[PDB]
Amino acid sequence: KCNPLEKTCPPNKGLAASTYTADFTSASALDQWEVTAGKVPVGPQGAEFTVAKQGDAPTIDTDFYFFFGKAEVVMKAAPGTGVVSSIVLESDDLDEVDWEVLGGDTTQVQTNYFGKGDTTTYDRGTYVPVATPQETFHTYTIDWTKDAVTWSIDGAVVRTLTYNDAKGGTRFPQTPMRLRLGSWAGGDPSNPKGTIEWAGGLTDYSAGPYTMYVKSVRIENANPAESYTYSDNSGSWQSIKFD
């Protein structure tokens, strides 16, 4: 939560490899992850993100950050009105690329991005058709280069954000990012009306529980390093130092 746009921050721990793969069949697979809220059991269908009662927001974050490359997640989304299933790439300056599935919307996934925590417009969000994301696994793939972010589902391109498209590159995600996986109630009664409407309605916890499943993760790090340092206030990929 230390923002390098505002302060000098300690370095991000790096994925010092070109490839990271986790089959979530195994208890082992959570080695390089932090269960950063709730409890995330690892059954035969992989890591389980259950929303059972209000305040349930089970999440895992990678210990490491990667700097360009690829994030591929095999996920079956949680069902249920207002239950959100989230795949997030996020940097310490709040550059961000994500997938959002809504439990009651059985025909789409939302694609999204933020540059530097800037939520000013809503040119960031696009819905794409997907067959029953709550009832079947899909492969959600983000290809991330200095030229473009590409979203793919089951190896079909569904969205491309070019560097120029993201306010002339000023809002292009281009700082080292970690992968966050989680489910949560967008339709929590305590949420803003706008979040509940976006989530597709009020969440009924008693009609639960609602479980998102992640069976595997593949990360390709374009720039393997032990760590990344933001050398200035630019938030530019050019400002990122690593050995």
Numbering used by the authors: 24 to 266
Text taken from the publication that reported this structure:
The apo and the complexed structure were solved by molecular replacement and refined to 0.23 and 0.24 R/Rfree values, respectively. Both crystals belong to the same orthorhombic space group with two independent molecules in the asymmetric unit (AU). No conformational changes were observed between the apo and the complexed AfCrh5 structures or between the AU molecules with overall root-mean-square deviation (RMSD) values of 0.20 and 0.25 Å for 213 Cα atoms, respectively. Finally, a truncated form of AfCrh5 (residues 22–275, excluding the signal peptide, the Ser/Thr-rich region and GPI-anchor sequences) was expressed as a fusion protein featuring an N-terminal PreScission cleavable GST-tag followed by a His-tag.
AfCrh5 shares the general EXDXE active site motif present in most GH16 family enzymes in which the first glutamate, the middle aspartate and the last glutamate act as the catalytic nucleophile, the auxiliary residue, and the general acid/base, respectively.
